[PDB]
């Protein structure tokens, strides 16, 4: 029932997959640094679940939170990354069906304009940084 957007960035870090049976993302938080121009940390909350799912190390000087209403879809999604095996995820731009938008981090190297729809989860790898990030949507 799920669309797996390409995981962009490097092969490093510990695999993470954040999804909950018959749940969608209601909040996503990106942390990033001016020093490294990378995402370092991501937090996700799901509908009807007070648990915070976190990956990476929150060492950056900036954070943005996007709250998503239960009926609100992603109509516009770009992930900035550095390509290749030693790659990293550098930024995320999201626009929603209600005209909400966020811009986290940087877009100086490589971009993916992802699939769109109701954001259900995320997947990738993280240690100090977000090595690799892929979105997951409903069909």
Which residue among 11, 14, 49, 83 contacts its own copies (CB under 8 A)?
A: 83
- Note whether 37 and 80 are within 8 A (CB): no
The rounded distance, in Å, linking the Cα atoms of 83 and 80 is: 10
What binding mask, one character per residue, do residues 30-59 give for its own copies by CB under 8 A, x or -?
------------------------------
The rounded distance, in Å, linking the Cα atoms of 77 and 107 is: 13
Which residue among 63, 97, 118, 128 contacts its own copies (CB under 8 A)?
A: 63
Which residue among 12, 110, 118, 123 contacts its own copies (CB under 8 A)?
A: 110
Q: By C-beta, is 13 or 29 nearer to its own copies?
A: 29
Which residue among 20, 33, 54, 75 contacts its own copies (CB under 8 A)?
A: 75
The contacts of residue 130 (CB under 8 Å, 6+ apart) are 9, 13, 38, 39, 40, 41, 42, 55, 56, 88, 89, 124
The rounded distance, in Å, linking the Cα atoms of 132 and 20 is: 20
Residues that bind its own copies (CB under 8 A): 3, 5-6, 8, 27, 61-67, 69, 75-76, 83, 98-102, 109-117
């Amino acid at each position: 029932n799920y669309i797996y957007s390409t995981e962009v960035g490097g092969v490093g870090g510990t695999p993470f997959t954040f999804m909950q049976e018959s749940g969608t993302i209601t909040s996503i938080k990106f942390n990033w640094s001016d020093q490294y121009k990378l995402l370092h940390h991501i937090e996700v909350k799901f509908i009807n679940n007070a648990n915070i799912y976190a990956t990476g190390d929150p060492k950056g000087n900036h954070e943005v939170i996007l709250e998503i209403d239960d009926d609100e879809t992603i109509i516009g999604s770009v992930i900035g990354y550095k390509k290749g095996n030693d790659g990293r995820c550098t930024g995320v731009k999201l626009t929603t069906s209600k005209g909400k938008s966020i811009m986290a981090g940087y877009f100086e190297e490589s971009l993916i304009t992802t699939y769109t729809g109701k954001l259900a989860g995320i997947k990738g790898g993280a240690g100090s940084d977000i090595d690799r990030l892929g979105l997951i949507f409903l069909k």
